[PDB]
Amino acid sequence: DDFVAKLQDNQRFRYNEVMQALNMSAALTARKTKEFRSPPQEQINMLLNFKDDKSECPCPEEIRDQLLDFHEDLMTHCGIE
Amino acid sequence: SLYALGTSKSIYVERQRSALGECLAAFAGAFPVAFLETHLDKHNIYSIYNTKSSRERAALSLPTNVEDVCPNIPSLEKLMEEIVELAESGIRYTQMPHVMEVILPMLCSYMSRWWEHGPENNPERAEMCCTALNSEHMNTLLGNILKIIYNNLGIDEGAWMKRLAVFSQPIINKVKPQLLKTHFLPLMEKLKKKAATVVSEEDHLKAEARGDMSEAELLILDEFTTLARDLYAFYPLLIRF
Amino acid sequence: INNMSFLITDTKSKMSRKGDRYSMQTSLIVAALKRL
Amino acid sequence: MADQLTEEQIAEFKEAFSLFDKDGDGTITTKELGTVMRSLGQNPTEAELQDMINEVNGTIDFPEFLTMMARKMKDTDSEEEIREAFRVFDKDGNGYISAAELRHVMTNLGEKLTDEEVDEMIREADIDGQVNYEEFVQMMTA
Known part of the structure; x- marks a missing residue:
């Protein structure tokens, strides 16, 4: 619940500065709107693509840290480590 | 009223100068009395000072003086002398904006209208013609236009070049062919120098391309736009000549 | 600029939609070149 | 549904x-x-x-x-289908999209489909290059 709330807020903010800097970016506008023109399932799939390196993920570091901490806690609960 | 509008130096009339000049040119074309050349008035059969007679003209509100019916408008010879010293004395646009927007198009239309009644077309019963206009006046004024646009290629880029180009279209009809060597050769020579400069600059700029060429390619684009604007001010006259 | 207006004014004394605004074929430069 | x-x-x-x-x-x-x-x-x-x-x-x-x-x-499928387009692009609102702006609107996003644009201009080409975004979209949003 909270993770998706924060992720949606960050995506809205990112789209905001992308729209603000559209005319400076010019050619970069298409590549920044590629994220927002993809179906929501693929949007979440590519937003959750930071499990291993792969800096091709718009997710910020704090949100990444939240997800990683929860994943580690869940693995501990499951008894993997 | 229209001549005072054209000659007036005011920020209010500044942005409407062009329309007033066009209206004055149209009126000069339409008006049947040679108002610029008042001295030979008596040979005009349509003149009010030739038809209405002294008693009726005094009954009406007329200055009774042919030279003073339109005192503010100078004589054609004086206008010719002024334009001749322009484009030759190094004209500054701060004091001379009105001239090439109002006064020259009026003279162009006046010449186009009054050439037919000039003595050169009908040398029979000469010196009784309504106007003293001549093909040599036409050549002199066209050379003056060529010289002023020559001086104004790179300075004061505006719509008045294409305006003067379309207004002076009728003048070219009765030009001597030697005006080519007289003025067109330096004019097109300088245009070709500008074209060579801009194409060389384009070739130099094509080598480099990065994030920030904008601060140079905008200037180069301005160069091409100015060159094309001068080219369209030029080639009608040359083509039709 | 009508572009062709200069030629129309020239041929006016002798009485001589899709492309109303502008046309490739009637460029002023190529017209001058073909006249010379 | x-x-x-x-x-x-x-x-x-x-x-x-x-x-x-x-x-x-x-x-x-x-x-x-x-x-x-x-x-x-x-x-x-x-x-x-x-x-x-x-x-x-x-x-x-x-x-x-x-x-x-x-x-x-x-x-009621006339204005909201183009409302998003009017919000995202066409700040001037002229509908005559500029040259670079039209590169950008057909900058393929993920699908990377081809021959559809060149097909559209071989089937119809505007004149005055200068492609109209309106005429461009009603053809699909009929």
């Missing part, structure tokens, strides 16, 4: 239909077929009712009814 309808509007369809309720078959006959959406808020004409009765033992239920608003979903 293939997930294009939103939860809030589906819920208010149900609340209007439950205004007559009665086990999903009672008080919802062809006599109230118009009354339910008259109370909901938009007015069904003879064309709307014939669209309701085109494919319709004789007494509707909620699946059939919301199936009817699926084909009525076809209504």
